């Protein structure tokens, strides 16, 4: 969906779109999608653009441009969501968390997890590293 | 709700229990004489 982004990327993206829009229609050419992304720091090579128009005629409207930035931002955020989700598990932050620490903080997180689900969770996997916890979460 | 308001516990005496079934009989008495029921 598009609720993954806050207000403040969307108000910035309409700021970039209405700056380089042609006549206020909400239209840009297949050149201007390149210059509107390099105006904000993001510098993709032309294969990254090459698939998104094939994904969406020559008329790139503002809901089409908003959906392409949402997929361009969510893939790196879905790859990096899980490390900061791992940070409250260990006290130091290198990735090493105790097994005795993990049965009161993971049964109390608010998804109605009982004592039985985290007991199945850790014995289908001392202290375990960080990259194994992605290996055991995504499965 | 204007009728059924009165509609681990000691045994009910015989004088009091008629008061409920008379109050209930009167509470809905006004509500069937005054047209109503035949709607």
């Amino acid at each position: 969906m598009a609720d993954q982004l806050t207000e403040e990327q969307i108000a910035e993206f309409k700021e970039a779109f209405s700056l380089f829009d042609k006549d206020g229609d909400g239209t840009i050419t297949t050149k201007a999608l390149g210059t509107v992304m390099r105006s904000l720091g993001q510098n993709p090579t032309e294969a990254e653009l090459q698939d998104m128009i094939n994904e969406v005629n020559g008329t790139i409207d503002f809901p089409a441009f908003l959906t392409m930035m949402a997929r361009k931002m969510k893939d790196t955020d879905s790859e990096e969501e899980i490390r900061e989700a791992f940070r409250v598990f260990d006290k130091d932050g290198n990735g090493y968390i105790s097994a005795a620490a993990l049965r009161h903080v993971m049964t109390n997180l608010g998804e109605k997890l009982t004592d039985e689900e985290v007991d199945e969770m850790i014995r289908e996997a001392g202290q375990v590293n960080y990259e194994a916890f992605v290996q055991m979460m995504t499965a | 709700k204007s009728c059924h308001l009165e509609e681990e516990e000691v045994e009910v005496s015989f004088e009091e229990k008629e008061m409920e079934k008379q109050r209930l009989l009167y509470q809905q008495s006004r509500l069937h004489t005054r047209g109503a029921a035949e709607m």
Partner: protein, 97 residues
């Protein structure tokens, strides 16, 4: 009118408004009046169902609750969807999917 709706910077940040104003409700009758006809010969005023059904699809791809609120009309939508076939861009069957 609908083209200016999808540029206002506000129909992206506060979806809860648009279900409270409920314009998706009102726009729905707009489609049913024009498409109401005896047979396929009653395809008067084309190029507007396509121009409006595109807006509905993007509305359905903004939040989960937005998906639920319009989903409940699925039986209503399919009742008058598999008759007027032959154009491009969009059709009520697409937003049903």
């Amino acid at each position: 009118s609908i083209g200016n709706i999808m540029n206002n910077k506000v129909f992206y940040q506060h979806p809860n408004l648009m279900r409270a104003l409920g314009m998706h409700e009102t726009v729905m009758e707009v489609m049913v009046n024009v498409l109401g006809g005896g047979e396929t010969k009653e395809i008067r005023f084309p190029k507007m169902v396509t121009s409006c059904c595109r807006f509905l699809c993007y509305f359905c791809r903004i939040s989960r609750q937005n998906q639920r609120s319009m989903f409940d009309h699925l039986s209503y939508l399919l009742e008058n969807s598999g008759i007027g076939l032959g154009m491009q861009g969009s059709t009520p069957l697409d937003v049903a999917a």
